[PDB]
Structures are given as structure tokens and as C-alpha cells.
């Protein structure tokens, strides 16, 4: 089997991407944030505190003839930015782009933090990291990908995120028309539950490539590119007027600037992020100071190849016995 679904930026800045997911019988379609940095599938629901729901589409398990409460099971998750949610657990039928899993754990939110309440376009998350990170207690549950793996033509999914444009998540096959040149595969460590890999270095604009190992995670659920302070300083030094602002919380730059590209290494191959991808617009409405898409990972504790990086590539998440990551230009 295979699946294929279109993923859509939630706003003009590509702050995140939503993908329609069918849950239950008859289908309830919710737009979820596919997140290769977490491993819980959770949804706004009929059980979510009313004051904490603000425009989202909810899952109503009582209206699903295939929903079964998973007795005793609860979940609670906190994300890298301080967001959180928690609730109870059903199993139900979940389909993504024609690909169906029966008995998928659907984590129903009783509580969500304000940042989720404020994002009216995100109805929940669908985690695609390794199932070892799943927060369901007392019996940990598997991700959608993990559940589907055996049935897929090939045990892979691919992320093809658009810049200010729709893109595609595919399950079970590699669309050879979706990228240019070849796919370069690189080793993954699953020891922290992430799609963790090592970039072979970077360049800024037309500058010479610096060979240097950069350990980080491929994370579709993170907006920006978070890299070591040395790397990030080297980038923003090439932008006149750019500065790190503690009050704003990162590097800012004059909105009148033209940004240089940023290249990262995958083995011997190179992925080029166009400068426009690194512009996240005014820090506040009407401001002439703009927020940068490349930021320091210092104090995060890990480097993150988020959407800024991933949307410049066709990315293969290979879930073979020994997982690997593939990157191609597009």
C-alpha cells in the first residue's frame, strides 16, 4: 500500500504545515501538523476544555462507530517551545492520503496550552519520530508510520514541503519525478528517538564550504533552522545591520536587506536554502526589523533542521531495520 497527501502552509510565513487526516467512521477530517520531531497523534476533540478551543475542528469519538476508549490510558506532552497538551486515548481508524491504519491510537486532548488555542488552523499533531518517544501511559503506543510500515510497498515516507506553496507527504514510495539529481542517504541515530543525523558542513552565500560535523534532527514540526552559534554568527555577519536581539529573542535584520543563501552538507552532496526562505518578516506589524530564519541552537541543547532547511529539499525518511535519511535537491 501507499498514501499521498498534500500539505499546506498555515500562513504567509510558512510557520507550519497542515495535512488533512481522516479519523473514525464515518470519516472526521482534521488538519494535522505532521511532526517528525514527536511521536504522538493528538487531536482537539469533544473532550477539550471549551475555553481552550477557538476555531479548530474537533474529533468527536462518540460519533465514530470504530472508536474504542483505551481504558486507563493517558498522555501528556511538552514541546521544545514550551507548548503542551494532555488527555485520554482512543483507538480508531486513521487514513492519510488513501493509506489506512486500523486501531491507531488517537490521543484526545482534554487540555491544550494557549499557543495551540491561538492556532485556529491546527487541529492537532501527527508524530512521525520513533515510537520510543510516545507519551501514552501506562502502555506506550505506536506512531501512524510504525503501524503502517508492514503494509507499505517500501518502509518509507517522504516530505516535500513547499516555499509559500503546497507540498506533499508520501507514504510507502519515492516519487522520482519530485526531485532533481540523486538522493544522498546519510546515517541516522535513533538513540534519542529522533531522525538524528550529521551534516557535513555549510556555506554562506557564494562563500567556501566549511567542512564540519553538525549533529541535528530532521524536524518538520519546527519552523526554523537552529544551528551552532558559530555557524549562525557567520551567516548573519554577511547581512548588513543584522544583530542578535535578546528582547526579540534571536537574530533580526533590516527588512530592506537581501539575504544570502545557506548551504548545508549531506555527505558529499549540498542542499542550498535560498535567502528568501530565511526571511520571516517584521517582528511586529509595521516594523522595519525582520526576524531571521536561521537561529542559534545554544540553550536548546540540539541542532534542528526545521522547515526552513527541509523545504529546500526532497527528504526521505527511511524506516528500514536500520533507518536512514535521504536528501535531494528539487
Domains 5-174 and 175-330 share a fold: yes
| 281 CB neighbour count, 10 Å cutoff | 14
The Cα-based distances of 237 to 20, 196, 209, 232, 233 in angstroms read 40, 28, 16, 9, 6
Residues contacting residue 109 through CB under 8 Å, at least 6 positions apart:
42, 43, 44, 45, 47, 48, 85, 86, 87, 124
Exactly one of 33, 35, 40, 88 is catalytic; which is it? 35
Lookup result for grid cell 514510495: 173
Catalytic residue status for 35: yes
Specify whether domain 5-174 bears CATH 3.40.50.11610. Answer: no
Exactly one of 108, 199, 261, 297 is catalytic; which is it? 199
CATH code of domain 175-330: 2.40.70.10
The Cα-based distances of 8 to 35, 229, 313 in angstroms read 14, 31, 16
124-127/28-35 β-pairing: parallel
The Cα-based distances of 222 to 17, 35, 306 in angstroms read 10, 8, 5
Resolution in A: 1.7
Lookup result for grid cell 540523486: 182
Can you list the positions of beta strands (E) in 54-208?
Answer: 68-78, 84-96, 99-112, 124-127, 156-160, 167-171, 184-187, 196-204
Alpha helix (H) residue ranges in the chain: 114-118, 144-148, 229-236, 307-310
Residues contacting residue 44 through CB under 8 Å, at least 6 positions apart:
30, 53, 56, 57, 58, 59, 109, 112, 116, 123, 124
Rounded to 5 degrees, φ, ψ at 80 are -55, -25
156-160/303-305 β-pairing: unpaired
Catalytic residue status for 115: no
Q: How was this structure determined?
A: X-ray
Alpha helix (H) residue ranges in 178-306: 229-236
Q: What is the dihedral of CA 222, 46, 131, 104, to 10 degrees?
A: -130
The Cα-based distances of 102 to 23, 126, 129, 211 in angstroms read 10, 15, 20, 46
Say if residues 106 and 75 touch (Cβ distance below 8 Å).
no
Distance CA 169, CA 99 (A): 12
Ranges of each domain in the chain: 5-174, 175-330
Positive/negative CA dihedral, 211, 217, 222, 227: negative
Amino acid at each position: 500500500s501507499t498514501g499521498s497527501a498534500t500539505t499546506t502552509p498555515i500562513d504567509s510565513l510558512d510557520d507550519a504545515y497542515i495535512t488533512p487526516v481522516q479519523i473514525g467512521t464515518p470519516a472526521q477530517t482534521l488538519n494535522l501538523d505532521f511532526d517528525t520531531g514527536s511521536s504522538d497523534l493528538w487531536v482537539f476533540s469533544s473532550e477539550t476544555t471549551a475555553s481552550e478551543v477557538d476555531g479548530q475542528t474537533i474529533y468527536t469519538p462518540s460519533k465514530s462507530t470504530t472508536a474504542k476508549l483505551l481504558s486507563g490510558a493517558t498522555w501528556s506532552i511538552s514541546y521544545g517551545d514550551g507548548s503542551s497538551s494532555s488527555g485520554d486515548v482512543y483507538t480508531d481508524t486513521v487514513s492519510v492520503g488513501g493509506l489506512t491504519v486500523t486501531g491507531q491510537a488517537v490521543e484526545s486532548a482534554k487540555k491544550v496550552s494557549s499557543s495551540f488555542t491561538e492556532d485556529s488552523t491546527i487541529d492537532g499533531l501527527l508524530g512521525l519520530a520513533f515510537s520510543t518517544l510516545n507519551t501514552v501511559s501506562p502502555t506506550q503506543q505506536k506512531t501512524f508510520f510504525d503501524n503502517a510500515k508492514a503494509s507499505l510497498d517500501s518502509p518509507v515516507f517522504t516530505a516535500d514541503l513547499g516555499y509559500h506553496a503546497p507540498g506533499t507527504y508520501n507514504f510507502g514510495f519515492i516519487d522520482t519525478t519530485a526531485y532533481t539529481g540523486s538522493i544522498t542517504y546519510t546515517a541516522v541515530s535513533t538513540k534519542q528517538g529522533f531522525w538524528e543525523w550529521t551534516s557535513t558542513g555549510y556555506a554562506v552565500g557564494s562563500g567556501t564550504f566549511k567542512s564540519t560535523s553538525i549533529d541535528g534532527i530532521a524536524d518538520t514540526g519546527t519552523t526554523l533552522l537552529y544551528l551552532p552559534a558559530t555557524v549562525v554568527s557567520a551567516y548573519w555577519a554577511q547581512v548588513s545591520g543584522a544583530k542578535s536581539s535578546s528582547s526579540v529573542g534571536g537574530y533580526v535584520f533590516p527588512c530592506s536587506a537581501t539575504l544570502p543563501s545557506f548551504t548545508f552538507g549531506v555527505g558529499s552532496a549540498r542542499i542550498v536554502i535560498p535567502g528568501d526562505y530565511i526571511d520571516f518578516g517584521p517582528i511586529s506589524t509595521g516594523s522595519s526589523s525582520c526576524f531571521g530564519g536561521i537561529q542559534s541552537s545554544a540553550g536548546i541543547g540540539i541542532n534542528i533542521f526545521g522547515d526552513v532547511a527541509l523545504k529546500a529539499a526532497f527528504v526521505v525518511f527511511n524506516g528500514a531495520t536500520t533507518p536512514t535519511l535521504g536528501f535531494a535537491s528539487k
